[model samples]
Target: SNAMKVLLVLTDAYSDCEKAITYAVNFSEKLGAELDILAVLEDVYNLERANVTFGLPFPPEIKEESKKRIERRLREVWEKLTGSTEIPGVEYRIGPLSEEVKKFVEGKGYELVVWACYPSAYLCKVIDGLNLASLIVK
Candidate 1:
């Protein structure tokens, strides 16, 4: 398995996950390169929860409940991906989009990082700033 090649796919929401995974699987299959999918739990959820909790917009439990639901939904998507196709690897990380992705890439020596267009501003900045190669998928 010394192919000396790695491809990184950055996924945020369910749509991003689906598109990136589908594209990545096919790309890897044809190129004989390892595929790595990374899911970043953006802090927007936490910020929303903070606002909801501070203002009592809803019940305190509502935020907690939504968090659980989100996890479950994400899990279902992951299951669907693994069930339908063979993937090289997938990782879940919680933190700022750019920071975490940059760290992951630094450690892996990835040949390419793939991301969807209209990505978060921070993500776009990070991708643009990185020395590594990248693909912006539509």
Candidate 2:
């Protein structure tokens, strides 16, 4: 609906998903903006698989498996927290974080993008200083 004047991208993961939801709830209440929460499969390195796949080229299967497992776990946890409860105007997305988010922001002309504090050095660089930006702590 045209009433959805804002776009929020949640960096869904073990840590950030909870924070994202909390922020989304508060922002929706305060700014009267629709919330969009998406979980993406980033280029995250898995140390546990490193030993198993040593000497082999980076495995596509590993990446795909991680994406499926992580996304499922994140969804399950989030759903449990919400507990069949409904929050109006909230949505979810799952894909490559940077690509998906960039596509979303460009295609949708979102008024704003809200996400959790990304604590990775690489992500901090990509985010262009979202770490130090004003974040509503819940």
Candidate 3:
């Protein structure tokens, strides 16, 4: 696809993933592909296991508003990470990391997935199962 892209996810773990995001942008520059933002979110009230991930802080039903909130937050993160306001934008979805990555890759069409938000054991293998061209672990 001529519109091929990069997929990058971040949450409350943004600072931790700064290096990972930079890794993604580095790849984007190498290939001349855009890095689309992805924020894998859990329920506003609760979602277990990763007790302190990125929370949208909005109710689950109002998906649209929260989407913008995350995008706005993305800009803040982008600047903090690179000191630049330019961005590629998020795919806009709410769910677990596995579900979101699956959707963003196989279904929505993306090339590479540079994962780094919060460290995970299975996500790398999961992306290996994805149709994405490559998977880079941060």
Best by lDDT: 3
Q: How accurate is candidate 1 locally (lDDT)?
A: 0.58
Model 3 per-residue lDDT at 48: 34
* Best-to-worst TM-score order: 3, 1, 2
Q: What's the CA error at residue 77 for candidate 1, in Å? A: 10
Candidate 2 stretches greater than 4 Å from native: 1-4, 43-84, 87-96, 124-138
Model 1 over residues 33-105: C-alpha lDDT tens digits? 7676665655544555676678646445644544454445444555675564333445656556677778778
Collision pairs in model 2: none
Question: How accurate locally, in lDDT, is each candidate?
Answer: 0.58, 0.51, 0.62
Cα error of candidate 3 at position 16, Å: 2.7
lDDT of 3 by residue, 8-64 (tens): 865432344456666777766666776777766544314432435754344445455
Q: Candidate 2: lDDT of 115?
A: 59
Q: List the residue pairs that clash in candidate 1.
A: none
lDDT value, residue 80 of candidate 2: 61
